[PDB]
Coordinates of C-alpha atoms and ligand atoms in Angstrom, one line a residue:
Chain A
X1 CA 5.3 18.5 -2.8
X2 CA 6.5 16.7 0.3
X3 CA 10.0 15.1 0.4
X4 CA 11.7 13.2 3.2
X5 CA 15.2 13.4 4.6
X6 CA 16.6 10.8 6.9
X7 CA 20.3 11.1 7.7
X8 CA 20.5 9.4 11.1
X9 CA 22.5 6.2 11.5
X10 CA 21.2 5.2 15.0
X11 CA 17.7 3.6 15.2
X12 CA 16.4 5.9 17.8
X13 CA 17.8 9.0 16.2
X14 CA 16.2 7.9 12.8
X15 CA 12.7 7.6 14.5
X16 CA 13.2 11.1 15.9
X17 CA 13.9 12.3 12.4
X18 CA 11.1 10.3 10.7
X19 CA 8.2 10.7 13.0
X20 CA 7.8 14.5 12.6
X21 CA 8.0 14.1 8.8
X22 CA 5.2 11.5 8.9
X23 CA 3.2 13.8 11.2
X24 CA 3.6 16.6 8.6
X25 CA 2.8 14.4 5.6
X26 CA -0.4 13.0 7.1
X27 CA -1.5 16.4 8.5
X28 CA -2.2 17.5 4.9
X29 CA -4.8 14.8 4.0
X30 CA -8.1 13.5 5.5
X31 CA -8.4 10.3 3.6
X32 CA -7.5 7.4 6.0
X33 CA -6.3 4.9 3.3
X34 CA -4.1 7.6 1.7
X35 CA -2.5 8.5 5.0
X36 CA -1.9 4.8 5.9
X37 CA -0.4 4.2 2.4
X38 CA 2.1 7.2 2.7
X39 CA 2.9 6.2 6.3
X40 CA 3.9 2.8 5.3
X41 CA 6.0 4.3 2.4
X42 CA 7.9 6.5 4.7
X43 CA 8.6 3.6 7.1
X44 CA 9.7 1.2 4.3
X45 CA 12.1 3.8 2.8
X46 CA 13.6 4.9 6.2
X47 CA 14.0 1.5 7.9
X48 CA 14.0 -1.0 5.0
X49 CA 12.0 -3.6 6.9
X50 CA 10.8 -6.6 4.9
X51 CA 7.2 -5.8 5.4
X52 CA 5.4 -2.8 7.0
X53 CA 1.7 -1.9 6.9
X54 CA -1.7 -2.0 8.4
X55 CA -4.7 -4.2 9.1
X56 CA -8.0 -2.6 10.0
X57 CA -10.8 -4.1 12.2
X58 CA -13.9 -5.3 10.5
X59 CA -16.6 -5.3 13.2
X60 CA -18.9 -7.4 11.1
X61 CA -16.5 -10.4 10.9
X62 CA -14.3 -10.0 14.0
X63 CA -11.3 -10.0 11.6
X64 CA -8.4 -7.8 10.8
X65 CA -8.5 -6.9 7.1
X66 CA -5.4 -6.0 5.0
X67 CA -5.0 -2.3 4.3
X68 CA -2.0 -0.4 2.8
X69 CA 1.5 -1.9 3.2
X70 CA 4.9 -2.2 1.6
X71 CA 6.6 -5.6 1.1
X72 CA 5.4 -8.9 -0.5
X73 CA 1.9 -10.3 -0.7
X74 CA 0.1 -10.9 2.5
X75 CA -2.9 -12.7 4.1
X76 CA -6.0 -10.6 3.7
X77 CA -7.8 -11.6 6.9
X78 CA -6.6 -12.4 10.5
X79 CA -9.2 -13.5 13.0
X80 CA -9.5 -11.9 16.4
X81 CA -6.9 -13.5 18.8
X82 CA -4.9 -15.3 16.1
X83 CA -1.4 -14.5 15.1
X84 CA 0.8 -11.7 16.5
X85 CA -1.7 -9.3 15.0
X86 CA -4.8 -10.9 16.5
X87 CA -2.9 -11.3 19.8
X88 CA -2.1 -7.5 19.9
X89 CA -5.8 -6.8 19.2
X90 CA -6.9 -9.2 22.0
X91 CA -4.3 -7.8 24.5
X92 CA -5.1 -4.2 23.6
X93 CA -1.3 -3.5 23.4
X94 CA 1.9 -3.8 21.5
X95 CA 3.5 -7.2 20.9
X96 CA 7.3 -7.5 20.1
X97 CA 8.5 -10.8 18.8
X98 CA 12.3 -11.5 18.6
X99 CA 11.9 -14.9 16.8
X100 CA 8.6 -15.7 15.1
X101 CA 9.5 -19.5 15.0
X102 CA 9.6 -19.4 18.7
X103 CA 6.5 -17.4 19.3
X104 CA 3.1 -18.9 20.0
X105 CA 0.6 -19.1 17.0
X106 CA 2.5 -16.7 14.7
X107 CA 0.8 -16.6 11.2
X108 CA 3.4 -16.9 8.6
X109 CA 2.0 -15.1 5.5
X110 CA 5.6 -15.1 4.3
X111 CA 8.0 -17.9 5.0
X112 CA 10.8 -15.3 5.1
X113 CA 9.8 -13.3 8.2
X114 CA 11.8 -13.9 11.4
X115 CA 10.9 -11.1 13.8
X116 CA 7.9 -8.8 14.1
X117 CA 6.2 -6.0 16.0
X118 CA 2.5 -5.2 16.2
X119 CA 1.2 -1.9 17.5
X120 CA -2.6 -1.5 18.0
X121 CA -4.5 1.7 17.1
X122 CA -7.6 2.9 19.0
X123 CA -10.6 5.1 18.7
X124 CA -12.8 5.7 21.7
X125 CA -10.9 3.0 23.5
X126 CA -11.8 0.3 20.9
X127 CA -9.2 -1.2 18.6
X128 CA -9.5 0.0 15.0
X129 CA -6.5 -1.8 13.5
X130 CA -2.8 -2.6 13.9
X131 CA 0.5 -1.5 12.5
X132 CA 2.5 -4.5 11.7
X133 CA 6.2 -4.6 10.8
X134 CA 8.3 -7.7 9.9
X135 CA 12.0 -8.4 9.3
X136 CA 14.0 -11.2 7.7
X137 CA 16.4 -10.7 10.6
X138 CA 16.0 -12.1 14.1
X139 CA 15.4 -9.5 16.9
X140 CA 15.0 -6.5 14.6
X141 CA 12.4 -4.9 16.8
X142 CA 12.9 -3.9 20.4
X143 CA 11.8 -1.4 23.0
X144 CA 13.0 1.5 20.8
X145 CA 10.6 0.4 18.0
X146 CA 7.8 -0.1 20.6
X147 CA 8.2 3.3 22.0
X148 CA 8.4 5.2 18.7
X149 CA 5.8 3.2 16.8
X150 CA 3.5 3.6 19.7
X151 CA 4.0 7.4 19.3
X152 CA 3.3 7.0 15.6
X153 CA 0.1 5.1 16.4
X154 CA -1.1 8.1 18.4
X155 CA -0.4 10.5 15.5
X156 CA -2.4 8.1 13.2
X157 CA -5.3 7.9 15.6
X158 CA -5.8 11.6 15.3
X159 CA -5.9 11.3 11.5
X160 CA -8.4 8.5 11.8
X161 CA -10.6 10.9 13.8
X162 CA -10.1 13.6 11.2
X163 CA -11.2 11.1 8.5
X164 CA -14.5 10.5 10.2
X165 CA -15.0 14.3 10.7
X166 CA -14.3 14.9 7.0
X167 CA -17.3 12.8 5.7
Chain B
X1 CA -1.2 -19.4 2.2
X2 CA -1.1 -17.8 -1.2
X3 CA 2.4 -17.9 -2.8
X4 CA 3.9 -16.6 -5.9
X5 CA 6.2 -17.9 -8.5
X6 CA 8.3 -15.6 -10.8
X7 CA 10.7 -17.5 -13.1
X8 CA 10.3 -15.6 -16.4
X9 CA 13.1 -13.4 -17.4
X10 CA 11.3 -11.5 -20.3
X11 CA 8.8 -8.9 -19.6
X12 CA 5.9 -10.3 -21.7
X13 CA 6.5 -13.8 -20.4
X14 CA 6.5 -12.5 -16.8
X15 CA 3.1 -10.8 -17.3
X16 CA 1.7 -14.1 -18.7
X17 CA 3.1 -15.9 -15.6
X18 CA 1.9 -13.3 -13.1
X19 CA -1.5 -12.1 -14.3
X20 CA -3.2 -15.5 -13.6
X21 CA -1.6 -15.5 -10.1
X22 CA -3.0 -12.0 -9.4
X23 CA -6.4 -13.1 -10.6
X24 CA -6.3 -16.1 -8.2
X25 CA -5.1 -13.9 -5.2
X26 CA -7.8 -11.3 -5.7
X27 CA -10.5 -13.9 -6.4
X28 CA -10.3 -14.9 -2.7
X29 CA -11.1 -11.5 -1.1
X30 CA -13.9 -9.1 -1.5
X31 CA -12.4 -6.0 0.2
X32 CA -11.3 -3.6 -2.6
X33 CA -8.5 -1.9 -0.7
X34 CA -7.0 -5.3 0.3
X35 CA -7.1 -6.4 -3.3
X36 CA -5.4 -3.2 -4.5
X37 CA -2.8 -3.6 -1.8
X38 CA -1.9 -7.2 -2.7
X39 CA -2.0 -6.3 -6.5
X40 CA 0.5 -3.6 -5.9
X41 CA 2.6 -6.0 -3.9
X42 CA 2.7 -8.6 -6.6
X43 CA 3.6 -6.1 -9.3
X44 CA 6.3 -4.6 -7.2
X45 CA 7.9 -7.9 -6.4
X46 CA 7.6 -9.3 -10.0
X47 CA 8.7 -6.2 -11.9
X48 CA 10.6 -4.1 -9.4
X49 CA 9.3 -0.8 -10.7
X50 CA 10.2 2.3 -8.7
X51 CA 6.6 3.0 -7.9
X52 CA 3.4 1.1 -8.6
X53 CA -0.1 1.6 -7.2
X54 CA -3.5 3.1 -7.4
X55 CA -5.5 6.3 -7.1
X56 CA -9.2 6.2 -6.8
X57 CA -11.8 8.8 -7.9
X58 CA -13.3 11.0 -5.2
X59 CA -16.6 12.3 -6.7
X60 CA -17.0 14.9 -3.9
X61 CA -13.8 16.8 -5.0
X62 CA -13.2 15.6 -8.7
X63 CA -9.8 14.4 -7.7
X64 CA -7.9 11.2 -7.7
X65 CA -7.0 10.2 -4.2
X66 CA -4.0 8.0 -3.3
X67 CA -4.8 4.3 -2.5
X68 CA -2.5 1.3 -2.0
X69 CA 0.9 1.5 -3.6
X70 CA 4.6 0.4 -3.3
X71 CA 7.5 2.7 -3.6
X72 CA 8.3 6.2 -2.1
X73 CA 5.7 8.5 -0.6
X74 CA 3.5 10.2 -3.2
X75 CA 1.1 13.1 -3.8
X76 CA -2.3 12.4 -2.2
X77 CA -4.5 14.2 -4.6
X78 CA -4.4 14.7 -8.4
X79 CA -7.1 16.9 -10.0
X80 CA -9.2 15.8 -12.9
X81 CA -7.2 16.4 -16.1
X82 CA -3.9 17.2 -14.5
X83 CA -0.8 15.0 -14.7
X84 CA -0.5 11.7 -16.6
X85 CA -3.0 10.3 -14.1
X86 CA -5.6 13.0 -14.6
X87 CA -5.1 12.9 -18.3
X88 CA -5.8 9.2 -18.4
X89 CA -9.0 9.8 -16.5
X90 CA -10.0 12.7 -18.8
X91 CA -9.1 10.7 -22.1
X92 CA -10.8 7.5 -20.7
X93 CA -7.7 5.4 -21.7
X94 CA -4.2 4.3 -21.1
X95 CA -1.3 6.8 -21.3
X96 CA 2.3 5.6 -21.8
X97 CA 5.1 8.0 -21.2
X98 CA 8.6 7.2 -22.4
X99 CA 10.1 10.3 -20.9
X100 CA 8.3 12.3 -18.2
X101 CA 10.4 15.4 -19.4
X102 CA 8.7 15.5 -22.8
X103 CA 5.3 14.9 -21.5
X104 CA 2.9 17.8 -21.1
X105 CA 1.9 18.5 -17.5
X106 CA 3.6 15.5 -15.8
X107 CA 3.2 15.7 -12.0
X108 CA 6.6 14.8 -10.4
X109 CA 5.7 13.4 -6.9
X110 CA 9.2 12.1 -7.0
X111 CA 12.0 13.9 -8.7
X112 CA 13.5 10.4 -9.6
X113 CA 10.9 9.0 -12.0
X114 CA 11.7 9.1 -15.7
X115 CA 9.0 7.0 -17.4
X116 CA 5.4 6.1 -16.5
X117 CA 2.2 4.3 -17.5
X118 CA -1.3 5.0 -16.3
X119 CA -4.2 2.6 -17.0
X120 CA -7.7 3.7 -16.0
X121 CA -10.4 1.5 -14.3
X122 CA -14.1 1.8 -15.0
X123 CA -17.5 0.8 -13.5
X124 CA -20.9 1.6 -15.0
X125 CA -19.1 3.4 -17.7
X126 CA -17.2 5.9 -15.6
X127 CA -13.7 6.1 -14.3
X128 CA -13.3 4.8 -10.7
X129 CA -9.5 5.1 -10.5
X130 CA -6.2 4.4 -12.2
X131 CA -3.2 2.1 -12.0
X132 CA 0.0 4.1 -12.1
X133 CA 3.5 2.7 -12.5
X134 CA 6.7 4.7 -12.6
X135 CA 10.4 3.8 -13.3
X136 CA 13.7 5.6 -12.8
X137 CA 14.7 4.2 -16.3
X138 CA 13.6 5.9 -19.6
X139 CA 11.1 4.0 -21.7
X140 CA 10.5 1.3 -19.1
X141 CA 6.9 1.0 -20.3
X142 CA 5.7 0.0 -23.7
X143 CA 3.0 -1.7 -25.6
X144 CA 3.5 -4.9 -23.7
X145 CA 2.8 -3.1 -20.4
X146 CA -0.2 -1.3 -22.0
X147 CA -1.7 -4.6 -23.1
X148 CA -1.2 -6.6 -19.9
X149 CA -1.9 -3.9 -17.4
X150 CA -5.0 -3.2 -19.4
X151 CA -6.0 -6.9 -18.9
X152 CA -5.2 -6.5 -15.2
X153 CA -7.5 -3.5 -15.1
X154 CA -10.4 -5.6 -16.3
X155 CA -9.6 -8.3 -13.7
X156 CA -9.7 -5.6 -11.0
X157 CA -12.9 -4.0 -12.3
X158 CA -14.6 -7.4 -11.7
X159 CA -13.3 -7.4 -8.1
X160 CA -14.6 -3.8 -7.6
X161 CA -18.1 -4.9 -8.6
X162 CA -17.8 -8.0 -6.4
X163 CA -16.9 -5.7 -3.5
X164 CA -20.3 -4.0 -3.9
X165 CA -22.2 -7.3 -3.9
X166 CA -20.3 -8.9 -1.0
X167 CA -22.1 -9.6 2.2
Ligands
SME201 C1 2.0 -9.3 7.2 S1 2.0 -10.9 8.0 O1 3.3 -11.1 8.6 C2 0.6 -10.7 9.1 C3 0.4 -11.9 10.1 C4 1.3 -11.8 11.3 N1 2.7 -12.3 11.1 C5 0.6 -12.4 12.5 O2 1.3 -13.3 13.1 O3 -0.5 -11.9 12.8
SME202 C1 2.9 8.4 -8.1 S1 3.2 9.8 -9.0 O1 4.2 9.7 -10.0 C2 1.6 10.2 -9.5 C3 1.5 11.4 -10.4 C4 1.8 11.1 -11.9 N1 3.3 11.1 -12.2 C5 1.1 12.1 -12.8 O2 1.7 12.7 -13.7 O3 -0.2 12.1 -12.7
MG203 MG1 -0.4 11.4 3.3
MG204 MG1 2.3 2.2 0.8
MG205 MG1 4.4 -9.9 -3.6
MG206 MG1 -12.5 -6.3 -4.3
MG207 MG1 -5.9 -10.1 -2.2
MG208 MG1 0.8 -2.8 -1.3
MG209 MG1 -15.0 14.9 -14.1
MG210 MG1 7.8 4.2 -20.9
MG211 MG1 7.9 -2.5 -17.7

């Protein structure tokens, strides 16, 4: 059975400890939802963010649809271009928000969130979904999170491709 | 935005408070995984159990496959008939475990859980998955949990069927 150690006190060092563990945990499963669910579990345990999880693109509706996550209840559907999530999708790149109250068109599924980061995932150069993380603290996410969650996105993208191949 | 109230300080009273809120939240989405994810979130926030979430039957492999959940990372696959989860599937009914150490063939995905409840979900007669909840406390789950998580199971079953008819 897999088990996770994370000892490191500095943010960047904790990512360097956590990412290889995630890689190992998801290497062992083809099911995409299972892998997203365990990913978000590892992130929540390691970093303690208020909310962390995924939305996946629905090509039929041009909406992000809620997938696995840790934290309180969330909105199920985010239109293309709306919110930090829909902005990330539209831009094709990561969005870091130091103060959600000061950010344009943030969607507040929780009144409690104050900062956020959204990292898009791609297959064949099309966005398939986003990783979203939220904090109750202002400015919880910075370039360290963008770098390492971007690397995690790459690891997950490969698992998405494995999930398609496994059908 | 959907938004939850938990006042109740007694377990049974809290189920009575929370089940209608879950029913409302899941009524307004057809995607099965989104609904499971938000249900796990509501249960985790309301009851604070160590782990709460779902496994879904994979008919290709005769295994339960990890779906949305809250709590630490978990096993991705449980064979038919193995563990509390596989036993609930094989029995076609709820299994309540007061102490995972006296239970035959408990699967310990975390070393920290001490008590558990599994409630199966059905469609067209057959098991489609299970709700599993785990606690670090002994005997956290009793007849109140069996009753009300069984009613939750039926609420969810109706959403599974609605997911198949949605367009
Ligand atoms: C999980 S919840 O915070 C998702 C919506 C997001 N804040 C956004 O602005 O898109
Ligand atoms: C989430 S984890 O505890 C799942 C396995 C379960 N205890 C079982 O015995 O089937
Ligand atoms: Mg996994
Ligand atoms: Mg999860
Ligand atoms: Mg909640
Ligand atoms: Mg549904
Ligand atoms: Mg829902
Ligand atoms: Mg969840
Ligand atoms: Mg069978
Ligand atoms: Mg018990
Ligand atoms: Mg209980």
